[PDB]
């Protein structure tokens, strides 16, 4: 129930998803991501994230779903060395509660819809700014999902949409 020893088999196995195993990955993943977005038109900003090698991609269908129903994406900028914000792609900032939703990139996740993080600590922190009970969203391939016990400092996670 070790944390390092769940990063390295995730990190491992990451790398080693071959490109036409990803694509069926993320298009399946991007798929229920669709599907859970779809019933809730309350939400109408929403945090992504820049995928980094080997995280979940979004997929083109996906930003199709957000400028049909007329979703504004934000992305996360590290201000430091323990905070991050949100802009658009003008650069505009978006407050923590001018945000409806997150989508949160992860190295691993437990039963307890806990989060695994890179270490750096911005999502926690950032979180706590919430007022509005936004969903707070993990995306992740199953194989991301592991045993260990988590931290307070370890982000809780509403749900975590992954392949199954």
Request: aromatic share 12%; net charge neutral.
């Amino acid at each position: 129930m070790d944390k390092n020893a769940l990063r390295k088999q995730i990190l491992q196995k990451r790398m080693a998803l071959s490109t036409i195993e990803k694509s069926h990955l993320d298009q399946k993943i991007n798929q229920k991501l669709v599907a859970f977005l779809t019933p809730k038109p309350c939400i109408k900003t929403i945090a992504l994230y820049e995928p980094i090698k080997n995280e979940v991609t979004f997929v083109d269908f996906f930003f199709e779903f957000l400028k049909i129903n007329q979703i504004r994406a934000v992305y996360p900028k590290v201000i430091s060395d323990t905070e991050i914000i949100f802009i658009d792609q003008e650069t505009n900032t978006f407050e923590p509660n001018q945000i409806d939703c997150f989508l949160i990139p992860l190295v691993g996740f437990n039963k307890d819809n806990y989060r695994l993080g890179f270490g750096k600590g911005y999502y926690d922190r950032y979180l706590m700014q919430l007022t509005r009970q936004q969903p707070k969203i993990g995306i992740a391939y199953s194989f991301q999902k592991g045993d260990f016990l988590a931290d307070p400092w370890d982000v809780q996670l509403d749900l975590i949409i992954n392949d199954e």
